[PDB]
């Protein structure tokens, strides 16, 4: 465990919100809220092209199989259906009335969910884009949408710790999960099997929650997450690894069985908004907000 | 299991037949003027309109790969299409008009086609090497045949009553029985359908009686057998003849449509009683009935109108509260005053 | 062989042979079909169940246990279609519904 | 522009007739004001009774700890007072009526009919409420998301 | 062949003439719509039984004998057609 | 007599039967050793049916034969 | 001298639809006369239909048509289904 700095991805006008790697080692664009998506690289920061022309800042952008097809979850209550080599507004998604926080293409590449805050969540079509359903996704605003390994389950996060695994074919979720905290959950996600969900309970104790029982496996220590948005990552390249984001200008990389403090990596100048992981190689990015305006690549 | 009206489709008139894929996502509405309208469920939209022909498209069949339909008409062309952009790959202008097409489920080079008069002969995709399926009597002029579930055999049916079973490509005569219709008068066959789990199958006879058999039972019977039916279904009150039968998503709930009255009847495989009669517009005549494999919703084709019959989940959605059980009277209990398992998360 | 009654062969509660004898010996027609007493016994069973359900509900709602004809009178006249079926029928020992018109009451 | 970069900072008998039909009254339907609401698959007529506010009776003082309970799991945002003496909870175990929302044109009000077991919050009607109209009550103690005609866009 | 109206097709002077056959001097205004409603209700209660007799007889043509029999069950016996 | 039945799961079963029994008695013996009611235990010889109103000599059954079975919900 | 009544069958149907609810003799005589009345009406309409078609056989078809004529709306829409289910269970 000697993960060393390799590159630096600067050149931002506003704060960077997210990094999300390509599924097979292709790209990592500037998924920020700066009205800019510059197609940066994952291996060496290879600048490809400029895809911009937005009205407001993008909360997060989606991703595709070829890491090209996008849809903008911007803050102007609209969504364009994007392509890299087009630069053209195909259609417009309408049905929100607040911040479009999050949107996803499923791993089968045939759905466009779009998360909202006043529960105007609509699951859209990739081809047509017709108004289908308002969803009562929580009692609270949504802070995560995700699709599992195959694409029949939708996890969603709340401001009181609702791990609702929404069904794709029917629309009725199965199991309600809870903690004794009152957690404003910034992010939940699936696993490579869909059974363990890492929520956000904000007293420096983030828990990996089971599918059926709703218990936790191993409650980690030594991390800093009480107010700010921090993603949730795992690594399958070599052995067991735990990678997350930080707040105190560090890079959080640990192991699952230990629950210790064995590696933290200085090098940032802001609260780490985002880290991410790569399946075959230990190529790890680490993004931060406006007081850094860089995305620093890491590699063993 | 379907209990409502739930909506219908006024999109394109003159609907004639349809079926589904393995997954149940689209809907290939066959039309009178040579069209296949494709409609979606979860997005409720029409993606592709293949204006195939000008003649009545009679039969349809999806394949397993999700790419290859097959159809025929009074155009009498054994066509084929693809859902990406409407690519008619092949075009077999043939005589002797067609009733039913049917793939082998995984060896999808081989399709099985029923002509008007003579025996069904197994066509292919590329070559014209049709494999002649030998029917002995040949005086019945309407003989229907099919695979089993896994494509492991070929089941046949004449108009006299004799049933023969052949191997899927080399035609091993392994089973032979005449059906026990009446005492002195037998009857013909109009369809034989198959499930998605198990080898039970129905015999749509023409004395208003459906008969149900299993594959293991007739393979135990074999050559010169007298297989008794698992179940005998009819409706002696209304005196109704049948048009088209099918199965459920598990092979438990037989859905047989009428031919007089625009009504659906639903049985059970195990017990064998009626469970619910469905209804719709009383002034139509029903032709084709589609069952959905993973979620029990039915489609009914009559007068160009195709209807969606769900059950609405009137019980409730229970997504939020497995907890929070109800106390009717104001029950009070106000006396009171106050790292074990490692499963592969990365699997 | 054995002897199953035609009630328990069909899963009913009313008899079937009694209905069949009443159809043959009332001179309703000359030839009675096979399924007719089965269908009619089913119809009579459903109507008796439909009235006794509402009767038992009213009998629980007046804190009694048995059913006396006041409960049948209330459970028939408080309904919406059994009222139309029993439109011209006086139940003996019945009494009437509690009904007062509008303008009689003082302001 | 980002919210992610910013940190998160005669009456009794007809009433019991209504008590015998609680499955028959409504089903748990939605409302696009916020999540759910309550619709009807029927027309709720004039002088038709709907629901009773039941659940778990808080004593005089226990609300002073229930307000601390509201800071753990954010449990009850569904309040309605019984009286000066007591409050009724509907969050742990009790009445499932915790999805009756409010728009600034409320179609129901609160009324009290008292049994031997105490005062009970009883709902009736004064008009023929039609099919699918959301039942919602005036509060009289966060802006609304309804879009109503002549709407105050508040709570009370 | 779908029809839309003719519940208004029974005119205003026709109800006036029916009332002046009945021995009526002076008519108010709402009687027109009320009488249209009453006539529609009675014709539904006859046509239900006529169509049921037809569908049982396995035909497609409503014959006048069936209208006479429906009126026989209603309790208004009609003379002069069967 | 010691007969064997080849069911749908290969359950080659043993019995205490005789050359002087009927069919319903054999099926009640299988009921008593297993718990399965006698409404389905269709003994099959050369692909046919054996009726519950005959003996074990009304079909020329040779002793210690190997028979077949098809399950059947005749509880209906 | 042996009469005929429907007391035991109202006993059985009441004990199926309610566990522990007794029934007095007055209500039993009411239910006896009720079932005789409904039976007479349905058989009367069946005989009139069997004479109007110039048939000579009461099948179950005419009983269905008589029930559909005589019972108003929703009660007919349940009773027809109950009868069809009973006959279809009677066959096998
Ligand atoms: Zn409002």
Swiss-Prot record, chain A:
One of its GO terms (cellular component) is MLL1/2 complex. This is WD repeat-containing protein 5. One of its GO terms (biological process) is regulation of transcription by RNA polymerase II. It is found in: Nucleus. PANTHER family: WD REPEAT-CONTAINING PROTEIN 5, WD40 REPEAT PROTEIN. WD repeats lie at residues 11-50, 53-94, 96-136, 137-176, 180-221, 224-264, 267-300. Changing residue 176 to M: Found in a patient with childhood apraxia of speech; uncertain significance. The modification N6-acetyllysine is found at residue 80. Interacts with PAXBP1; the interaction is direct and links a WDR5-containing histone methyltransferase complex to PAX7 and PAX3. Interacts with HCFC1. Component of the ATAC complex, a complex with histone acetyltransferase activity on histones H3 and H4. Component of the SET1 complex, at least composed of the catalytic subunit (SETD1A or SETD1B), WDR5, WDR82, RBBP5, ASH2L/ASH2, CXXC1/CFP1, HCFC1 and DPY30. Core component of several methyltransferase-containing complexes including MLL1/MLL, MLL2/3 (also named ASCOM complex) and MLL4/WBP7. (Microbial infection) Interacts with herpes virus 8/HHV-8 protein LANA1; this interaction regulates the MLL1 histone methyltransferase activity on viral DNA. InterPro entries: G-protein_beta_WD-40_rep, WD40/YVTN_repeat-like_dom_sf, WD40_repeat_CS, WD40_repeat_dom_sf, WD40_rpt.
From Swiss-Prot, chain D:
Component of the MLL3 complex (also named ASCOM complex), at least composed of catalytic subunit KMT2C/MLL3, ASH2L, RBBP5, WDR5, NCOA6, DPY30, KDM6A, PAXIP1/PTIP, PAGR1 and alpha- and beta-tubulin. Forms a core complex with the evolutionary conserved subcomplex WRAD composed of WDR5, RBBP5, ASH2L/ASH2 and DPY30 subunits; WRAD differentially stimulates the methyltransferase activity. Interacts (via WIN motif) with WDR5. A motif (WDR5 interaction motif (WIN)) lies at residues 1-6. The gene is KMT2C. It comes from Homo sapiens (Human). It is found in: Nucleus. The SET domain interacts with histone H3 but not H2A, H2B and H4, and may have a H3 lysine specific methylation activity. Zn(2+) binds at residues 104, 144, 146, 151. Found in a critical region of chromosome 7, which is commonly deleted in malignant myeloid disorders. Partial duplication of the KMT2C gene are found in the juxtacentromeric region of chromosomes 1, 2, 13 and 21. Juxtacentromeric reshuffling of the KMT2C gene has generated the BAGE genes. S-adenosyl-L-methionine binds at residues 78, 101-102. The chain holds residues 4707 to 4911 of 4911 of the full protein. The lineage of its organism: Eukaryota, Metazoa, Chordata, Craniata, Vertebrata. This is Histone-lysine N-methyltransferase 2C. Residues 24-140 form the SET domain.
Swiss-Prot record, chain F:
Phosphorylated at Ser-65 by PINK1 during mitophagy. Phosphorylated ubiquitin specifically binds and activates parkin (PRKN), triggering mitophagy. Phosphorylation does not affect E1-mediated E2 charging of ubiquitin but affects discharging of E2 enzymes to form polyubiquitin chains. It also affects deubiquitination by deubiquitinase enzymes such as USP30. Mono-ADP-ribosylated at the C-terminus by PARP9, a component of the PPAR9-DTX3L complex. ADP-ribosylation requires processing by E1 and E2 enzymes and prevents ubiquitin conjugation to substrates such as histones. Changing residue 72 to G: No effect on ADP-ribosylation. It is found in: Cytoplasm; Nucleus. There is a cross-link at residue 76 (Glycyl lysine isopeptide (Gly-Lys) (interchain with K-? in acceptor proteins)). The record marks 68 as: Essential for function. Exists either covalently attached to another protein, or free (unanchored). When covalently bound, it is conjugated to target proteins via an isopeptide bond either as a monomer (monoubiquitin), a polymer linked via different Lys residues of the ubiquitin (polyubiquitin chains) or a linear polymer linked via the initiator Met of the ubiquitin (linear polyubiquitin chains). This is Ubiquitin. The lineage of its organism: Eukaryota, Metazoa, Chordata, Craniata, Vertebrata. The gene is RPS27A.
Swiss-Prot record, chain G:
Glycans are attached at residue 81. There is a cross-link at residue 89 (Glycyl lysine isopeptide (Lys-Gly) (interchain with G-Cter in ubiquitin)). One of its GO terms (cellular component) is nucleus. Its main location: nucleus. GO terms for molecular function: DNA binding; protein heterodimerization activity; structural constituent of chromatin. Belongs to the histone H2B family. This is Histone H2B 1.1. It comes from Xenopus laevis (African clawed frog). The chain holds residues 33 to 124 of 126 of the full protein.
